[PDB]
Paper text:
YeaZ is involved in a protein network that is essential for bacteria. yeaZ is an essential gene in many bacteria, such as Escherichia coli (yeaZ), Salmonella typhimurium LT2 (yeaZ), Bacillus subtilis (ydiC), Streptococcus pneumoniae (spr0129), Pseudo­monas aeruginosa (PA14_16710) and Francisella novicida (FTN_1148). A recent study further demonstrated that E. coli YeaZ can interact with either YgjD or YjeE, with YgjD as the preferred partner, suggesting that YeaZ is part of a protein network that may be involved in DNA metabolism and cell division. TmYeaZ belongs to the actin-like ATPase superfamily, which typically contains a duplication of ribonuclease H-like domains.
The crystal structure of TmYeaZ was determined in space group C222 at 2.5 Å resolution using the MAD method. TmYeaZ is composed of nine β-strands (β1–­β9), six α-helices (α1–α6) and four 310-helices (η1–η4). In TmYeaZ, the first ribonuclease H-like domain is composed from both the N-terminus (residues 1–100) and the C-terminus (residues 160–193) of the protein. Compared with the other two YeaZs, TmYeaZ lacks the 20-residue αβ insertion between β9 and α5 in the second domain. As a monomer of His-tagged SeMet-TmYeaZ would have a calculated molecular weight of 24 404 Da, it is likely that TmYeaZ exists as a dimer in solution. Based on its structure, TmYeaZ by itself is not likely to be an ATPase owing to the absence of a clearly defined ATP-binding site. The most prominent common feature of these proteins is the prevalence of the sequence motif GPGXXTGXR located at the N-­terminus of a helix (α2 of TmYeaZ). Other conserved residues of the YeaZ homologs that are clustered around this motif include residues from the N-terminus of α1 (Lys32 and His33), the C-terminus of β1 (Asp7 and Thr8), the C-terminal portion of β6 (Arg112, Ala113 and Arg114), β7 (Tyr119) and the C-­terminus of α6 (Pro188, Tyr190 and Gln192). We speculate that part of or the entire conserved surface is involved in mediating protein–protein interactions between YeaZ and YgjD (TM0145) or YjeE (TM1632) in T. maritima. As the UNL is close to the conserved surface identified above, it may have functional implications; an alternative explanation that cannot be ruled out at present is that it is a crystallization artifact.
Residue numbers in the entry:
A (entry chain A): 1 to 193
B (entry chain B): 0 to 187
Write the structure that this text describes.
């Protein structure tokens, strides 16, 4: 199974698998230096003797996150896959954050949007990931009400670990479950929700 | 923040390279042939950051528990790298790094397989910092389940361990600031 997965909702997270062999790469900081990543990735593809043509699925994160980062990551994936119609797995960044956490139980994912607001979701992670409150934007006051309502055992605020390995595992699962879509269908239903 | 390279080869290969607020993290898992590329990648990253090795403030290296060969190799790699310049070295406990790589707080059991019938095992209290309730040791598999019944951990990091290269960099930065680094000739 050949997989490439990319999330740009906060940092740059890239995951590359060919069979039992997985590279993971992250970058955070000033944008000037992210330039080196395509080069780096090409080198890793060359090492694995993998051509973009041979990928079974490409995973991309659809947010919630920063607009700029997300449109860059998505346009990148849309373009890479376009010539060969490689199935795309749209990945929920909040769900990738939850599953990147090795503990189980009631989890609350939040992250700053402007001034006095946050994006926010809560999941029961005891199977399983099972949504109790789907991601949306809330005031800080409502955030406290929500926390006080779900007494989450685990809470992942602001600086979110996403594991590229989980991205890759998640693209694989969507592929197998026939829940991937075509590159031309990622605008329409990244708008609608 | 400063200029830091850190590396743990206790199970998979984890690498963090930071310059100020810029940080690259790399991990590899799978057959050893392909690890050949990691040093090329890391040199491209260093050139991209305008970092020479002599510009590094500290180099972190994982010292286990883990696979002995992989530890020996990661350590040897570090010795080759820093001995010309005596860059301060931060030894990193792999289980502590694993525990710290987990977002949740509470009582954390960390365990990995050591040989037929045995695990390396440790227990920490995560409440803000990390506090060793039991330092790493080799227990029998029966002892392991006893340790588990008995400490009632909220969280259990077993056999397949997530270590975040960002965490290795943060830790190396700390030991440097606390002057609890050592010389390349002192690592084991």
């Amino acid at each position: 199974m050949n997989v490439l997965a990319l999330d740009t909702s906060q940092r740059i997270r890239i995951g590359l698998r060919k069979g039992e062999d997985l590279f993971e790469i992250s970058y955070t900081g000033e944008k000037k230096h992210a330039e080196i990543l395509p080069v780096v990735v090409k080198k890793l593809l060359d090492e694995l003797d993998l051509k973009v043509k041979d990928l079974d699925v490409v995973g991309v994160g659809i947010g919630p996150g920063g607009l700029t980062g997300l449109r860059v990551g998505i346009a990148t994936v849309v373009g890479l896959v376009s010539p060969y119609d490689i199935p795309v797995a749209p990945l929920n960044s909040f769900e990738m954050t939850a599953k990147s956490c090795p503990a189980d139980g009631v989890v609350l994912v939040a992250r700053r949007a402007r001034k006095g607001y946050h994006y926010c979701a809560v999941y029961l992670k005891d199977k399983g990931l099972n949504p109790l409150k789907e991601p949306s934007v809330v005031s800080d006051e409502e955030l406290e009400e929500i926390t006080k309502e779900f007494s989450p055992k685990i809470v992942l605020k602001d600086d979110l670990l996403i594991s590229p390995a989980v991205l890759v595992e998640e693209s694989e699962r969507l592929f197998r479950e026939k829940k991937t879509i075509h590159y031309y269908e990622i605008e329409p239903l990244y708008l609608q929700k």
